[PDB]
Design an enzyme around this catalytic site. Structure first.
Site, PDB file in Angstrom:
ATOM      1  N   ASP A  94       0.851  -1.210   0.000  1.00 48.26           N
ATOM      2  CA  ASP A  94       0.000   0.000   0.000  1.00 48.26           C
ATOM      3  C   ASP A  94       0.872   1.240   0.000  1.00 48.26           C
ATOM      4  OD1 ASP A  94      -3.205   0.256   0.142  1.00 48.26           O
ATOM      5  OD2 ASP A  94      -2.299   1.955   1.143  1.00 48.26           O
ATOM      6  N   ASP A 134       0.002   4.816   0.554  1.00 48.18           N
ATOM      7  CA  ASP A 134      -0.275   5.932   1.468  1.00 48.18           C
ATOM      8  C   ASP A 134      -0.012   5.437   2.897  1.00 48.18           C
ATOM      9  OD1 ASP A 134      -1.625   8.294  -0.091  1.00 48.18           O
ATOM     10  OD2 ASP A 134      -2.718   6.535  -0.763  1.00 48.18           O
TER      11      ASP A 134
HETATM   12  K   LIG Z   1      -2.741   2.963   3.821  1.00 49.06           K
END
Ligand SMILES: [K+]
Ligand SMILES: [Cl-]
Ligand SMILES: [Cl-]
Ligand SMILES: [Cl-]
Ligand SMILES: [Cl-]
Length: 233
Positions: A19, A21
Site C-alpha cells: 500500500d 499511502d
Molecule cells: K494505507
C-alpha cells in the site's frame, strides 16, 4: 530485529503488494499538518483521537465528523474544498518512509515480484509521487483506487485481488504478502486470503492491530526470511 506481534505463524510467500499511502509515503503526516493548520484558526486540536474517527472515511464524511466533534463553523463542503486545496500544495513534498528504499532495492536485487496498490486516484497519486518517479518505476505494476476492476474500496478485498491478478503469471492469493499501515487495509488483505505485515502509527491502539500476521514499529524491522525470502546481505 524486533516485532510488536504476530497473529499466526508466517508462511512462505512469492509476491509482495505494498500500500502506498502511510506505508511507503508519509502522507498521513501531510494530512495532519493541513488539518491542524485549519483547526488552529479555531483554537482546536486535530488530535489522534479525532483522526482515528475519520480513518477509512471518504473526504465529505470525514469533514462532517471533524466539524461536529470540534464544533467548527464551516460546512463539510467548505472544509473539503479548503483542505483539498492545501493538500494539492503539500502532496508533492511527501517523503519515503524509513526502510522503504532498502526493502525495494533488496526485492529488486533478488528478483522478487512486487507491486503497488493504493486507494488514491490518478490526480493525487501523480502529486504524491511527483518527486519519486524513479522509485515508483521499480514496481511491476500499480493499481489505483479508481481502477476498473475495483468495484469496492477497503476493507473489501478488491484492490488487493486486482493487484495480485495483474502479475504475469498470477500467483495464488495465499502466496501474496501485503504491507499496510491501516486497519481497513489489514482487513482487506485478510479478506483477500493474503498475509499482511502492518506498520501502524505508534499512536494507533493495539486492539486495532491484533489481526495482522506481523506488526512492526518500522519497515526497517522487516525480516524477509520470516516469509521465506532472502535475508539482507
Ligand atoms: K494505507
Ligand atoms: Cl495529532
Ligand atoms: Cl474521497
Ligand atoms: Cl484521491
Ligand atoms: Cl466503496
Amino acid at each position: 530485529l524486533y516485532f510488536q506481534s504476530m497473529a499466526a505463524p508466517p508462511q512462505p510467500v512469492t509476491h509482495l503488494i505494498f500500500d502506498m499511502d502511510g506505508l511507503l509515503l508519509d502522507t498521513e503526516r501531510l494530512y495532519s499538518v493541513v488539518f491542524q493548520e485549519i483547526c488552529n484558526r479555531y483554537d482546536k486540536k486535530y488530535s489522534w483521537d479525532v483522526k482515528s474517527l475519520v480513518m477509512g472515511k471518504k473526504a465529505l464524511e470525514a469533514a462532517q465528523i471533524i466539524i461536529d466533534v470540534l464544533q467548527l463553523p464551516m460546512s463539510k463542503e467548505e472544509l473539503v474544498e479548503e483542505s483539498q486545496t492545501k493538500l494539492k500544495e503539500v502532496f508533492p513534498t511527501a517523503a519515503l518512509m524509513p526502510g522503504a528504499e532498502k526493502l525495494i532495492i533488496h526485492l529488486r536485487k533478488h528478483g522478487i515480484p512486487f507491486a503497488l496498490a493504493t486507494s488514491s486516484r490518478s490526480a493525487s497519486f501523480d502529486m504524491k509521487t511527483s518527486r519519486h518517479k524513479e522509485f515508483f518505476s521499480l514496481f511491476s505494476h500499480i493499481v489505483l483506487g479508481d481502477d476498473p476492476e475495483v468495484q469496492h474500496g477497503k476493507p473489501d478485498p478488491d484492490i488487493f485481488l486486482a493487484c495480485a491478478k495483474r502479475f504475469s503469471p498470477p500467483p495464488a492469493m495465499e502466496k501474496c504478502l501485503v504491507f499496510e499501515d491501516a486497519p481497513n487495509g489489514v482487513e482487506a488483505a485478510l479478506a483477500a486470503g493474503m498475509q499482511v505485515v502492518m506498520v501502524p502509527d505508534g499512536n494507533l491502539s493495539r486492539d486495532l492491530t491484533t489481526k495482522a500476521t506481523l506488526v512492526l514499529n518500522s519497515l526497517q524491522d522487516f525480516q524477509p526470511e520470516l516469509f521465506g525470502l532472502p535475508s539482507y546481505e
